[PDB]
Write a protein that binds this DNA or RNA. Structure first.
Lengths: 683, 476
DNA sequence: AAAAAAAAAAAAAAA
DNA sequence: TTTTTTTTTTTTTTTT
């Protein structure tokens, strides 16, 4: 409406510019982001349609928003400024002095906005049609140079981010001398804090992976990066190095198809003992990975030795005999296992996209190494809970700074999306005859990624649309096989009636259904562009029974898909996974008489046994039962008659067992059953 | 000669570079001179090599560091280099200047002060090193004696601000002080020396100095900067009035100091409260000499900041009625005429603002129009449908019409904003007395119907409302 | 004996 | 300037 309003009637509106800008400013001070979006559009169109005085008033208004500001208003103003430098940089150049003046007021601004701010300022700066007013280059260089040259890490991060952002925008031979001199300055100021050099490596890596830019500085730097890495950590494979260590130092976790009496091995324990440079291992490998992917176009022919090289570590046997010692050596072990896990995660991030099958076997051995180190590290955290090895992700967690659930997503290096190319492979079973925890790990990651995105540094620079677009390939026709193999496992597990296998596979099932629920509850399907993707997606869910019925109507595909999906309700081991199945069926059946299937399936889950393990009945906790009975009582056609069914079976609890002819009915469950009963009676 | 320094710097530190440093003892000046003659990247390479070859735990290398500091500090100004080597030198010195004791940084800062007193800083790009050094004195917790290093920072700042500054390095000396963590007293010293330096400069190098003062104000001292710029430009306005007994220089300078104070009030809503508190007339009754044609143009421009609009217009309204009360009191009595020497009144100052605004001050004139109609709307008759309710209200309401009639004549764009608002008060009110608006509309028309045939349709749209008016309003 | 769930009271924000 | 409603926190009671 606002687009049509301005684009048609911008001669009626012209003479009343200032009142519009007095309006727009009030619709940026509010909460309720649809209002803020409206205000943003008013500033965009006031800039776009009006004459050269009102453009200047618009830019002045946005600069006042940024500088004076509070968080969301600052973000919105920086978003509008990015649109205004993209749209018409000629009329934005005449208002360069306002935007240059933002640099005197950078204490209010937080570093997620500082990346955007230097993006705006550099995008204004590096147009060759206004080299004569290069004053903003000088002022940007000054504020970079004053930040970079400071002991305080809170300023040094500003300097690093602004510096590499200037560098990245000025990379589309004198210009290359400028970029290399700037980057050498950043390197020199970073070298002497470790986490500062880490943030340099991290942010430079993000700059590579997001913007590919003219690869002249990249091939310039990468010939130094490979050499610096191969003398910084790469040692000849000698078993025991120098130094006095109260720990047997070996070359552990080598893949052993590699010859042992060879070259490349990676030094960890003499590095971290010398600290008390090893903390930058993973981001520096990420940078190396990205520059060689830019050079050899995905080929890592000189870095395949990094995949299988042993690691110079102590004996990482579970030290239960090494108790009564929680001294600094305990933190040494915990930090060591943490650093090698981050290293390993960077390896599996590195070699996941490669298609060579023996290399895929190497990657899978790396994944099983990861899960063994994770269970060892959680054992070491069960030794001492207080000894945090604090190494957050550098974008957001470090400025917050400057048990297993927090460090699972905040501390470790973040897996990439292409790491889920691994689960093309099919499971193998150790008990019945890619292991079950090696699938649990990937699915436990993917569920967290989907809930974070649809309801996390490298992820969120991808749009939600491309995320669900790549999920459509990299989940559904790949995870359907894992679902069917899981169904086949649980059929044999039902026929037979060790425990850790089934216990892991239950959580694997739960995560598969949770991913399915998070996928099919995507609100972007409500918008009229994405239903063709549904005409893909449930079509594949339709294709698991029979093919040949191509170009079908929508509700036919829905009926075929739910008819495929229903049958899993016999193989469901637990309660929460059942809840996820029925909620998935709910949210896919809302696209279309339907209530009969949901009511029957809820009744099937209510009359199912759900056996009497103590933690198993603990997974039939109150809120999950509450949600399930809300679904059942709402989705029955005869609500009061269903209440007579439940109260008719609500009386024989006391007469049989002090446990009913209708299970999930104890004395304890009747609080939940009663509350949902009279609650739905009220509704 | 440099290649052996690079080859010793390649593998390890402080084991061969120090030993080569005790071979060649002198002649690093001409080395770096021929180095900038050939290539500046090689000079940065040698600077990194020397700085890693000369640690600050040992005391032999610190003297080489000091000598190369003085060498680069002199060559960054005196030596006409290319810009990139200048940036690399200043970046390298600013980076490596952390690792020191107290007195070496203290004598570096003393060299800076002694240079900026007398020594011809050929450009003055070395000054960027100066705040970094003082910042390290903020964090140097190694004890000195003469004191704490922060007290040495206080004394060096006091020695810098108390001593003479050169005319060409007052913008750069203020821009430097933006990055030193200062307390209230240091920033008051800096603004006091800088405000002292206004009379000895080009007028066109006063707006950017005001800009650096306004961004540097935000730390402690807002009242001092506002009082200083209002006082200095009020004095200049008065001297220009006596010389009439530069103007496109003085008006285009005040027409850019005024925007700086307005923008700094937008980004900072306490600079505006300091301006309103510092200029308010109604302290108890007495009219202050802080109001002038400059300081009133600044109030009228701050009325387009929407938070200050009612507050500043009400301030100028009470500041006009007080002036007329004072003038009536003096004119009625000779005893007061003997004592009090003849003061300019707010009426004459406002009518000077309207004359001044002709050039480029369009920012002012939309606030002149609002003051005009606030004076007329608030002080027009009602008692016919006495001296105190009548004569300082008759005189304000006729100041209003004078503001709007003189503003109408010269500002060719707020015709149809006066003329459709005069008419809109004549037509629609018609119950309350509106003789003053018919007087003003008669003046506006009679003055130039030649300038009203370019804004005429605002008249012929009030012809359609002529039926519903009372008869005397139609005749009038 | 400890942990989890649910309710009630207090604070804060919007009309 | 005043009142209501929602959200968060804390306590108490029940269960494992």
């Amino acid at each position: 409406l606002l687009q049509s309003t301005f684009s048609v009637h911008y001669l009626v509106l012209k003479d009343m510019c200032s009142s519009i800008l007095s309006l727009a400013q009030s619709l940026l001070h509010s909460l309720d982001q649809s209002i803020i979006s409206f205000g943003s559009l008013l500033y965009k169109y006031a800039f776009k349609f009006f004459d050269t005085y009102c453009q200047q008033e618009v830019v002045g208004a946005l600069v006042t928003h940024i500088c004076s500001g509070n968080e969301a208003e600052v973000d919105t103003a920086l978003d509008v400024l990015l649109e205004l430098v993209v749209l018409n940089p000629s009329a934005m150049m005449m208002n360069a002095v306002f935007v240059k003046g933002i640099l005197d007021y950078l204490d209010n601004i937080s570093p997620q906005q500082i990346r955007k701010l230097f993006y705006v300022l550099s995008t204004l700066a590096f147009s060759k049609q206004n080299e004569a007013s290069s004053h903003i280059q000088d002022d940007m260089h000054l504020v970079i140079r004053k930040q970079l040259s400071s002991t305080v890490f809170k300023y040094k991060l500003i300097g690093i981010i602004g510096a590499v952002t200037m560098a990245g925008i000025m990379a589309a031979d004198e210009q290359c001398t400028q970029v290399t001199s700037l980057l050498q300055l950043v390197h020199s100021c970073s070298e002497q804090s470790p986490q500062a050099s880490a943030l340099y490596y991290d942010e430079f890596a993000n700059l590579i992976q997001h913007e590919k830019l003219d690869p002249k500085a990249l091939e310039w730097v990468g010939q130094t990066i490979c050499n610096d890495f191969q003398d910084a950590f790469v040692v000849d494979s000698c078993v025991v190095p120098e130094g006095d260590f109260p720990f047997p130092v070996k070359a552990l976790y080598g893949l052993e198809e590699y010859d042992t009496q060879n070259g490349i091995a990676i030094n960890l324990l003499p590095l971290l003992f010398s600290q008390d440079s090893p903390l930058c291992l993973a981001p520096y490998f990420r940078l190396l990975r990205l520059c060689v992917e830019r050079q050899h176009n995905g080929n890592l022919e000189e870095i395949d030795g990094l995949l299988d090289c042993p690691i110079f570590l102590t004996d990482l046997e579970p030290g239960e005999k090494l108790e009564s010692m929680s001294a600094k050596e305990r933190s040494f072990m915990c930090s060591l296992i943490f650093l090698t896990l981050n290293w390993f995660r960077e390896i599996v991030n590195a070699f996941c996209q490669e298609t060579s099958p023996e290399m895929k076997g190497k990657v899978l051995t790396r994944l099983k190494h990861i899960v063994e180190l994770q269970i060892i590290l959680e054992k070491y955290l069960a030794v001492t809970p207080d000894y945090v090895p604090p190494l957050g992700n550098f974008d957001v967690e470090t400025l917050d700074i400057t048990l297993l659930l927090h460090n699972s997503h905040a501390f470790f290096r973040e897996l990439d999306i292409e790491v889920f190319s691994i689960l093309h492979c099919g499971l193998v079973t150790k008990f019945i005859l890619l292991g079950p925890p090696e699938l649990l790990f990937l699915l436990e990651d993917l569920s967290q990624k989907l809930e974070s995105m649809l309801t996390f540094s490298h992820l969120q620079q991808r749009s939600a649309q491309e995320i669900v677009h790549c999920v459509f390939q990299l989940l559904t026709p790949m995870c359907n096989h894992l679902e069917n193999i899981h169904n086949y496992f649980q059929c044999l597990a039902a026929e037979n009636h060790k425990v850790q296998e089934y216990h892991i596979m239950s959580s694997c099932y739960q995560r598969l259904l949770q991913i399915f629920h998070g996928l099919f509850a995507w609100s972007g399907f409500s918008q009229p562009e994405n239903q063709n993707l549904l005409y893909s997606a449930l079509h594949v869910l339709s294709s698991r029974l029979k093919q040949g019925e191509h170009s079908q109507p929508l509700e036919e595909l829905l009926s075929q898909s739910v008819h495929y999906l229903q049958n899993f309700h016999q193989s469901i081991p637990s309660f929460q996974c059942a809840l996820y199945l029925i909620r998935l069926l709910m949210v896919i059946l809302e696209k279309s008489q339907n209530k009969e299937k949901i009511a029957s399936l809820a009744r099937q889950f209510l009359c199912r046994v759900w056996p009497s393990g103590d933690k198993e009945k603990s997974n039939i906790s109150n809120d999950q039962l509450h949600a399930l009975l809300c679904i059942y009582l709402e989705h029955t056609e005869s609500i009061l008659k269903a209440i007579e069914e439940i109260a008719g079976v609500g009386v024989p609890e006391l007469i049989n067992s002090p446990s009913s002819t209708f299970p999930t009915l104890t004395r304890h469950t009747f609080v939940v059953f009663f509350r949902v009963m009279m609650a739905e009676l009220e509704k | 000669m440099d290649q052996k320094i690079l080859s010793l710097a390649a593998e390890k530190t402080a084991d061969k570079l120090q030993e080569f440093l005790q071979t060649l003892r002198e002649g690093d000046l001409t080395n770096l001179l021929q180095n900038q003659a050939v290539k500046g990247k090689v000079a940065g390479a040698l600077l990194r090599a020397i700085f890693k070859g000369s640690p600050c735990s040992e005391e032999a290398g610190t003297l080489r560091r000091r000598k190369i500091y003085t060498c680069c500090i002199q060559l960054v100004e005196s030596g006409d280099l290319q810009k990139e080597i200048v940036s690399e030198i200043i970046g390298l010195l600013m980076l490596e200047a952390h690792h020191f004791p107290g007195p070496l940084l203290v004598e570096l800062a003393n060299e800076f002060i002694s240079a900026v007193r007398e020594g011809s800083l050929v450009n003055g790009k070395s000054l960027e090193l100066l705040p970094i050094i003082l910042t390290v004195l903020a964090t140097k917790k190694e004890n000195l004696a003469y004191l704490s290093g922060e007290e040495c920072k206080k004394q060096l700042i006091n020695t810098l601000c108390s001593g003479r500054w050169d005319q060409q390095y007052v913008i750069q000396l203020t821009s430097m002080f933006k990055d030193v963590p200062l307390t209230a007293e240091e920033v008051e010293f800096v603004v006091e020396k800088a405000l002292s330096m206004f009379s000895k400069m080009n007028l066109q190098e006063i707006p950017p100095l005001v800009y650096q003062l306004l961004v540097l104000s935000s730390k402690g001292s807002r009242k001092s900067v506002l009082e200083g710029i209002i006082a200095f430009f009020s004095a200049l306005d008065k001297q220009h009035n006596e010389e009439q007994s530069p103007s496109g220089e003085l008006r285009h300078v005040e027409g850019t100091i005024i925007l700086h104070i307005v923008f700094a009030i937008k980004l900072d809503y306490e600079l505006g409260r300091e301006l309103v508190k510092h200029l308010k007339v109604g302290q108890q009754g007495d009219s202050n000499n802080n109001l002038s044609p400059f300081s009133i143009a600044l109030l009228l421009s701050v009325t387009r900041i929407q938070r200050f609009q009612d507050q500043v217009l009400d301030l100028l309204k009470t500041s006009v009625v007080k002036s007329f009360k004072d003038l009536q009191l003096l004119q009625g009595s000779k005893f007061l005429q003997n004592l009090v020497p003849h003061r300019s009144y707010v009426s004459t100052m406002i009518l000077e603002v309207v004359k001044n605004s002709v050039h480029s001050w369009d920012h002012v004139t939309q606030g002149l129009v609002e003051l005009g109609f606030i004076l007329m709307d608030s002080y027009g008759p009602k008692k016919v449908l006495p001296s105190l309710s009548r004569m300082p209200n008759q005189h304000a309401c006729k100041l209003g019409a004078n503001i709007l009639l003189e503003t109408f004549k010269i500002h060719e764009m707020i015709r149809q904003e006066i003329l459709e608002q005069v008419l809109n008060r004549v037509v629609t009110r018609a119950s309350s007395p509106i003789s003053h608006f018919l007087d003003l509309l008669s003046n506006i028309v009679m003055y130039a119907p030649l300038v009203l045939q370019n804004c005429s349709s605002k008249v012929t749209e009030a012809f359609d409302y002529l039926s519903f008016l009372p008869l005397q309003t139609v005749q009038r």
